[PDB]
Amino acid sequence: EIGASSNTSDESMIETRCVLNSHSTAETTLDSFFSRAGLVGEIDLPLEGT
Amino acid sequence: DRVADVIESSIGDSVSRALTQALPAPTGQNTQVSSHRLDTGEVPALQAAEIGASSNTSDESMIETRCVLNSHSTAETTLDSFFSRAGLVGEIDLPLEGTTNPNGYANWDIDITGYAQMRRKVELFTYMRFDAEFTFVACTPTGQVVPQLLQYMFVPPGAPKPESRESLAWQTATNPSVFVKLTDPPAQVSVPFMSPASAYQWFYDGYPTFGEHKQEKDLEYGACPNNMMGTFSVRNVGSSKSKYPLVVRIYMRMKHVRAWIPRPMRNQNYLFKANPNYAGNSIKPTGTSRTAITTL
Amino acid sequence: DRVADVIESSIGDSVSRALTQALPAPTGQNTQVSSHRLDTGEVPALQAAEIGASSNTSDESMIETRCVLNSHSTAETTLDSFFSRAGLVGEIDLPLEGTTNPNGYANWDIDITGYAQMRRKVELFTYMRFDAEFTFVACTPTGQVVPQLLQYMFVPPGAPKPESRESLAWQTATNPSVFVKLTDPPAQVSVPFMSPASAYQWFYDGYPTFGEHKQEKDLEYGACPNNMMGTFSVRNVGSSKSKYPLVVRIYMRMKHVRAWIPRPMRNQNYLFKANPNYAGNSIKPTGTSRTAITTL
Amino acid sequence: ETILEVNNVPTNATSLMERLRFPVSAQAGKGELCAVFRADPGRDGPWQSTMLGQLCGYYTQWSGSLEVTFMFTGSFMATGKMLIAYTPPGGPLPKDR
Amino acid sequence: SIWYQTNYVVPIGAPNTAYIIALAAAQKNFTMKLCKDTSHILQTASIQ
Amino acid sequence: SDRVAQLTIGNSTITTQEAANIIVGYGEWPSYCSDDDATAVDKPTRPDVSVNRFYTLDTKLWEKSSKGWYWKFPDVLTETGVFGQNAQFHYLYRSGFCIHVQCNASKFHQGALLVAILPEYVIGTVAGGTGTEDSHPPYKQTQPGADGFELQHPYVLDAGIPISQLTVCPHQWINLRTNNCATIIVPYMNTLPFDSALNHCNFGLLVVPISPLDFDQGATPVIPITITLAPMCSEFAGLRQAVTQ
Amino acid sequence: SDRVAQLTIGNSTITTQEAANIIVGYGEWPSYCSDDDATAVDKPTRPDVSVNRFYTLDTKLWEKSSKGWYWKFPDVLTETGVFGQNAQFHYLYRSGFCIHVQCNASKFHQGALLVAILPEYVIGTVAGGTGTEDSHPPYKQTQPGADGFELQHPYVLDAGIPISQLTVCPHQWINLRTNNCATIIVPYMNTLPFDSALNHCNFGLLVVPISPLDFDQGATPVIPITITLAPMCSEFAGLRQAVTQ
Amino acid sequence: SDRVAQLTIGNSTITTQEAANIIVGYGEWPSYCSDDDATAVDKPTRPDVSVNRFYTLDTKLWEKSSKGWYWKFPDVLTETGVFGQNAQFHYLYRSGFCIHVQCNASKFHQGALLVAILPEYVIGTVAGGTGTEDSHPPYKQTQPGADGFELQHPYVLDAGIPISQLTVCPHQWINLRTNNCATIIVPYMNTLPFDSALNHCNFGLLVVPISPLDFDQGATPVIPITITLAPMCSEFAGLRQAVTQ
Ligand SMILES: Cc1cc(CCCCCCCOc2ccc(C3=NCCO3)cc2)on1
Ligand SMILES: Cc1cc(CCCCCCCOc2ccc(C3=NCCO3)cc2)on1
Numbered sequence A: 001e002i003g004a005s006s007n008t009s010d011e012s013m014i015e016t017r018c019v020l021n022s023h024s025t026a027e028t029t030l031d032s033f034f035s036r037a038g039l040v041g042e043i044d045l046p047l048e049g050t
Numbered sequence B, C: 001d002r003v004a005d006v007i008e009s010s011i012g013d014s015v016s017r018a019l020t021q022a023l024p025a026p027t028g029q030n031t032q033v034s035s036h037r038l039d040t041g042e043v044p045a046l047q048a049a050e051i052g053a054s055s056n057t058s059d060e061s062m063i064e065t066r067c068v069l070n071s072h073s074t075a076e077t078t079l080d081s082f083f084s085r086a087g088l089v090g091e092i093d094l095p096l097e098g099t100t101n102p103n104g105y106a107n108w109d110i111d112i113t114g115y116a117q118m119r120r121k122v123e124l125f126t127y128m129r130f131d132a133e134f135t136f137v138a139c140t141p142t143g144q145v146v147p148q149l150l151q152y153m154f155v156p157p158g159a160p161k162p163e164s165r166e167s168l169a170w171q172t173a174t175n176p177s178v179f180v181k182l183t184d185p186p187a188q189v190s191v192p193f194m195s196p197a198s199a200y201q202w203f204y205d206g207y208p209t210f211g212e213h214k215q216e217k218d219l220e221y222g223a224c225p226n227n228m229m230g231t232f233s234v235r236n237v238g239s240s241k242s243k244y245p246l247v248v249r250i251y252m253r254m255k256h257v258r259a260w261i262p263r264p265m266r267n268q269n270y271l272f273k274a275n276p277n278y279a280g281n282s283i284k285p286t287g288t289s290r291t292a293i294t295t296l
Numbered sequence D: 001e002t003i004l005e006v007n008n009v010p011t012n013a014t015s016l017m018e019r020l021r022f023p024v025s026a027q028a029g030k031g032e033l034c035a036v037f038r039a040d041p042g043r044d045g046p047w048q049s050t051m052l053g054q055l056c057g058y059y060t061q062w063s064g065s066l067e068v069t070f071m072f073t074g075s076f077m078a079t080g081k082m083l084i085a086y087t088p089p090g091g092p093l094p095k096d097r
Numbered sequence E: 001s002i003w004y005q006t007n008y009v010v011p012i013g014a015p016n017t018a019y020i021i022a023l024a025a026a027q028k029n030f031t032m033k034l035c036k037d038t039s040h041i042l043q044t045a046s047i048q
Numbered sequence F, G, H: 001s002d003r004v005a006q007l008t009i010g011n012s013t014i015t016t017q018e019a020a021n022i023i024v025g026y027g028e029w030p031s032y033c034s035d036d037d038a039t040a041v042d043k044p045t046r047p048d049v050s051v052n053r054f055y056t057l058d059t060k061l062w063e064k065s066s067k068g069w070y071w072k073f074p075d076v077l078t079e080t081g082v083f084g085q086n087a088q089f090h091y092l093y094r095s096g097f098c099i100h101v102q103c104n105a106s107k108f109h110q111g112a113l114l115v116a117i118l119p120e121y122v123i124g125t126v127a128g129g130t131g132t133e134d135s136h137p138p139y140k141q142t143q144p145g146a147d148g149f150e151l152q153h154p155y156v157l158d159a160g161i162p163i164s165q166l167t168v169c170p171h172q173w174i175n176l177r178t179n180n181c182a183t184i185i186v187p188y189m190n191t192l193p194f195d196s197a198l199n200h201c202n203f204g205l206l207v208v209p210i211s212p213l214d215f216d217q218g219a220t221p222v223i224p225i226t227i228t229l230a231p232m233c234s235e236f237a238g239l240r241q242a243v244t245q
Helices: A030-034 B079-083 B116-122 B216-220 C079-083 C116-122 C216-220 D016-020 D051-056 F081-089 F163-168 G081-089 G163-168 H081-089 H163-168
Strands: B087-094 B105-109 B125-139 B149-155 B177-181 B187-191 B231-236 B246-262 C087-094 C105-109 C125-139 C149-155 C177-181 C187-191 C231-236 C246-262 D022-025 D033-035 D059-063 D066-072 D082-084 E002-004 E017-026 E031-035 F005-009 F012-016 F055-062 F069-072 F090-102 F110-119 F171-175 F181-186 F203-214 F223-239 G005-009 G012-016 G055-062 G069-072 G090-102 G110-119 G171-175 G181-186 G203-214 G223-239 H005-009 H012-016 H055-062 H069-072 H090-102 H110-119 H171-175 H181-186 H203-214 H223-239
Touching: B079 B116, B079 B246, B087 B105, B087 B116, B087 B231, B125 B177, B149 B246, B177 B187, B231 B246, C079 C116, C079 C246, C087 C105, C087 C116, C087 C231, C125 C177, C149 C246, C177 C187, C231 C246, D016 H163, D022 D033, D051 D059, D051 E017, D051 H163, D066 D082, E017 H203, F005 F090, F005 F223, F055 F069, F055 F203, F081 F090, F081 F223, F081 G081, F090 F110, F090 F203, F110 F163, F110 F181, F163 F203, F171 F181, F203 F223, G005 G090, G005 G223, G055 G069, G055 G203, G081 G090, G081 G223, G090 G110, G090 G203, G110 G163, G110 G181, G163 G203, G171 G181, G203 G223, H005 H090, H005 H223, H055 H069, H055 H203, H081 H090, H081 H223, H090 H110, H090 H203, H110 H163, H110 H181, H163 H203, H171 H181, H203 H223
Parallel strands: none
Antiparallel strands: B087 B246, B105 B231, B125 B187, B125 B246, B149 B177, B149 B231, C087 C246, C105 C231, C125 C187, C125 C246, C149 C177, C149 C231, D022 E017, D033 E002, D059 E031, D066 E017, D082 E002, F005 F012, F055 F223, F069 F203, F090 F181, F090 F223, F110 F171, F110 F203, G005 G012, G055 G223, G069 G203, G090 G181, G090 G223, G110 G171, G110 G203, H005 H012, H055 H223, H069 H203, H090 H181, H090 H223, H110 H171, H110 H203
């Protein structure tokens, strides 16, 4: 109800081992996510047409 | 306070014992002067292959040797030297009239096990980690260069695979695509080591699903998802018939290579991709044959 | 070097957490002066039995109390005080004419669960460790003292149990035997805590064999071998008829007692040894009964 | 956290709001099964209703623990105990509690 | 899988059936890589 | 900060918002066997998380007439999980337990359960009524395993002992107006460092309605009682093939 | 001090008076998973002695015509012992192995077996002889478990690869005139820290007669080959119910 | 010290004994416009207490079938109070808001409302059903002012967006068994320092029943929802005559 996401940690829900997470979060930045060319416009210049 | 057997208990030792060390070997080992040796108790020549180790006998122990300063390099024998050589791994047809790929587009399942030369080299090892340089050589079946525009698009597994030349998927808003004319030099691009595993696996002795594993499903034996990198799609950019029959050859050059667990080199002709099947009735000897062991 | 979860891993902690401590209590706790208390937030009287703990409310919190220096001893409430009292645990008959034990000898299976008084006291606890003083009172059924010589012999399990008054076993070359006249004061001897377990077990919820556990064998439920100390054999020393009818009463006085896990005191009449069986149709209330809760 | 359409069954366009929550009611037996679903977030199914599932569609691979908070919306007077269970790979959908 | 540990109990005068709402997200050790295009959706008639 | 609680062992977490504290049997946390308390010389297994975790074994229905039930322990968890396996494969077993009995109702229901741990809970028989016949309780009654067993004469705990005094044992009550669960932590109790999980049951768990369940008609009539428990400091030795009994 | 040896794990001890040293696969002793090599966050089980011990799985009869056999590994030990259990109950498995293959005869018999470890031993088919049919080896052939499986075309190891080169794998020979057993210690080899003991077989054990068995008539004609092996540093995680396959 | 609360601005005080904390939109308290974030050179008005106070704008009736409602903001408070005036008289407006949505019932009722703030809440149309007609929502639907507007397709928030994901917005729930009011404090959010309170609505307030309201018959059936809100740090500039729209 409060409006906040559960802050419960894995360690509190099960006996956990130790893991050294070195996975990068670089590819999740806005620039990574958006700096990808994509089609946004198409223009026709036909010979015969309307 | 503790129970002792718990205090010694080496359970939880993350580091491996080793037993061997990598030493520098830029050149071949030199030969040192050897002299005659007439003695008992010392037998270099005698070995016991049963042990499972290669004979450590030196040239110096088998003959009186001179001295030679071997400065021959061993550089060309590194994995990078051996593997960083572009080779054909894929071929895609985009004919005008046919049953293969009309409509003007194709979807090549990214799998390098389709061509014998490259396949055998890599199947030398069990695991391989590396980046690669993919080069795409396009032209007509005659080998003629034509003023045509293409679009190559890497489609990671889970992404919408194009269903037609005008598929919406070609907007390639997040996928990486390449636009090239056949008149421009072959397109080349750099690819990283993508895969959830630490290395690509040429051989996966197991299944990937966890089911019943009946007859029909024996199709999945040896199928390791950590190797299915997705598909490579290509189309002539437009909304009308290509006008020219095309062909694209995909060459791959591995770089920044790491390889593990060497295996016996392929012995029999290859038959299918990701499947070591061999021709049971045409099992030929590893090599040539003579008429007698006492004659050349 | 290690995996951490192995370094903390408290697995192998031999010592118990405790949570309670034994304090000196030679006398009853004294009462200290109490005065009126009219306040909020503090409620001694209020408890929550659900928790499983006894009310810790003090007299001082329920009434204005004076001061009393309680010097009443608690010595007589120790296990040794309570248990170190000789009591009848065995009775053996050696009649002249009869079906019980003619021939002039008997074998009493050492089991103290045969008499109600002593049995109930010990069944107060689940486990008990102690030494004991066995005293043997012999005489005729009339209570008359007679010039007769007896031989008592402790026969540990596995030792040859005498088959007759003249059994070879009476050589008692390694067993401990006692020779006494009925005219001599009752024989008394000191016995240690023999048993492979750390304590005798009044209740053993389990079986001792590991088999099928069918109907016929339900006779073995609750039978714990760590309690079967062997048999006590007695004979009139000789090769001819006793000449006098005898009776031996075995009294046991526990000493150097340790007891664990108190249980509810026996509620229904006892029926058989080492077997809590009760009379299903004669299940009586723990105690007396009235006519109404509003009348004495 | 975003609403996980565990109850991704209804489709009447009138009952679409019904997917946002599953029921729990006074049972009679013991250990009755309430609901079930895949933990896979990038897979089709309930996760597709969540912002997480949606953002996954944009990436080929992922890694990490996931959390699913269940909020009970019954009356203050209603009590109850449920057992939520995550069954790791290889384990077929548990037949009973 | 969600099971009834005991049972949904209620007094007289209260709804015999109620609902649960699930809210889900990723934990702190969560990360993603190698981005592609969402499959889920693709439209139909070129946007007017 | 006392009516709410969370128990977490292995990969299991129990939750509760109407607890009544936690009892620790005879005031002692489960520990592993001392190096001088032991005799068996072979080095033991201590599976840890694969066995020390919560197993929700069974549900009973509390009714206005219920007499009460009991479960013998070491046994109850055999055949179930990795714990059960180590118990069949090994001769010797040793462990403590965290027992969490749960049962809830509405603020309009009423009743009270006595939840106790009775070590070496030897069962008796009615002796054929007259008490002349020396009958004995069957393997089905002495070691019911999960599913437990219902009492027939709770007043004497089917063993000739007053239940009125059962509270001298680590117990706790489930009074509906007050709480909805019992939590008792039991240490390993035996006269030996290890014993067979198969032929010996270190203790029994009693769940008995002392104040009958009651409620006006119309309120949900199905009030269940569920038993969840977790081994603690489980240790095994004496490895051989797997034996059932 | 090299032809005699004693291997002791758990409650098992192998003895030998005609050994030929010990091979340590790729020169590396089995270790546990690094805290930075792992991903699965749950704390694992390390049963230790109850699983890391010698299991003598099977005996084959060596005959003057025998082609050779193989056993896929992770698999082979399932269904057997406490190891098998932790493997069915847990999703993730990890472990090394000490493989001791034994076979003896008299100083008057002769023959030579090649004992090798081939990681990721993928099996192939004859492709219907003509090689036009895309057949695939059955669950019975790819994962035979104990009892192993006999080769049909050893020259190519039923996979189109020359056995003549199988020695680039941790191997050892059993030459009757010289020794009577092979001992190879294999470390965990995979591209992942843990994997499923069920659908993945990290490697296969090949026992092939390269120099045929022979002897003059009258000498005991029953020359068996027995496979004994022991897991090392077994670790499990991902607990659920028991799954067979 | 968290379920009770008191909000006081100007000459208004809201009280509550079953709150669920306070949300602060995007974690930022309403502030005044920086001297370097602004462009309009005229010195602004900051009426303070006469405008920054609680206005209890309207009451809706929650019914077992209710779809949900929304109110566009800047707008909602026009025409009402001194705030409304400064908004008509001035071109430029800027301000944050403290939104307190209230709705109570008995411990015997049940239901759950989602209360969220969706910035730039652009409304869409069903496009004539077939979706071929390019219809557009009327001034009556886009800017309903007080009285708000009822949703017709809440699942997509009448804008083709999943409500299931509406929680990535400053929200809060009103779960009857738990609380009876939502409190969200929103800072000024726009791409400009000031904008017109008339043609632009910085955000919309959504109040949607996700878990339907229900109760046994006989309990008061009229469960209202009231919206109370207060501007914070209201600033105005660009004075002219009073304009309505
Ligand atoms: C731009 C652009 C780039 C591309 C193609 C990128 C291809 C990246 C390929 C990486 C391939 O790694 C492999 C590993 C294993 C196998 C394999 N095939 C049979 C089993 O193993 C094949 C490829 O397309 N467009
Ligand atoms: C000399 C000499 C001494 C003796 C008799 C020695 C007897 C020592 C007896 C020790 C008994 O300890 C017991 C413990 C338990 C039980 C028991 N009976 C039912 C289950 O528990 C009986 C005796 O005989 N001769």
